[PDB]
Design a binder for this molecule. Structure first.
Ligand SMILES: CCCCCCCCCCCCC/C=C/[C@@H](O)[C@H](CO)NC(=O)CCCCCCCCCCCCCCC
Length: 235
């Protein structure tokens, strides 16, 4: 019932419609890196000189659930334990138990101006048709406007639409036995569409993205694996 409910539903449903489509067999999409179960793809797109390069990654992370992965991705209290591209951030507003607006500044990359971002971050469970099947969990981070964080002259305001979409697969054990983490897999689709908000040199931006996206996916998924080990499974 907060004011962004309609916008949230739009962004989430657009991800469920378009962000899970195949890119492995798409000629416009290029494999950047493959390491283990992680695959990172990019489509090279510049629009009026501005590098927009859609990014899509997939991963399959043993021993964690989608609910767990999304909780850790969304929870600002653990953000600094895994995120390495930020200088500073704060929660601007709490909209609901599952939705917040965050302001953050990113590490500066020479020669371009420092970027900042202002986004709504929402975590949502998408039920299957019935409880016979696993729900999908999604975290969506998308730029919004807010009076407490106006455009400023110190940073260029980037515009983002990012999603982490998690499906959980279980190999059920025999008879009356308990489910172990060894028999759960979380399939992650991560999509980032970032508009740098103003001019930036293409070669510079592209090398940083190519480095930072897989670094993040490896570091973040390992972090969740580490922190959930020995804890009861949260489905
Ligand atoms: C040490 C170099 C770092 C430079 C970082 C400058 C990027 C500024 C543009 C805004 C990027 C928004 C990233 C999305 C963040 C949130 O959803 C979330 C929680 O923070 N983290 C990720 O999704 C994890 C996202 C991982 C970020 C990958 C890096 C993106 C590179 C894109 C190229 C822009 C370069 C900036 C212009 C010079």
């Amino acid at each position: 019932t907060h004011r962004f409910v309609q916008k949230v539903e739009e962004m989430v449903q657009n991800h469920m419609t378009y962000s899970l489509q195949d890119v492995g067999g798409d000629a416009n999409w290029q494999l950047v890196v493959e390491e283990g179960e992680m695959k990172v793809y990019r489509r090279e797109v510049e629009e009026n000189g501005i590098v927009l390069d859609p990014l899509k990654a997939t991963h399959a992370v043993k021993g964690v659930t989608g609910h767990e992965v999304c909780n850790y991705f969304w929870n600002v209290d653990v953000r600094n334990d895994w995120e390495t591209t930020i200088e500073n951030f704060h929660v601007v507003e709490t909209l609901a138990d599952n939705a917040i607006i965050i302001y953050q500044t990113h590490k500066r990359v020479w020669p371009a101006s420092q970027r900042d971002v202002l986004y709504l971050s929402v975590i949502r469970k998408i039920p299957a048709l019935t409880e016979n099947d696993p729900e999908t969990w999604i975290v969506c981070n998308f730029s919004v406007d807010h009076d407490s964080a106006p455009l400023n002259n110190r940073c260029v305001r980037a515009k983002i639409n990012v999603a982490m979409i998690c499906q959980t697969l279980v190999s059920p054990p025999e008879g009356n036995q308990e489910i172990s983490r060894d028999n759960i897999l979380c399939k992650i689709t991560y999509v980032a569409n970032v508009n740098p908000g103003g001019w930036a040199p293409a070669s510079v931006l592209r090398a940083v993205a190519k480095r930072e996206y897989p670094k993040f996916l490896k570091r973040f998924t390992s972090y969740v694996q580490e922190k959930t080990a020995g804890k009861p499974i949260l489905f």
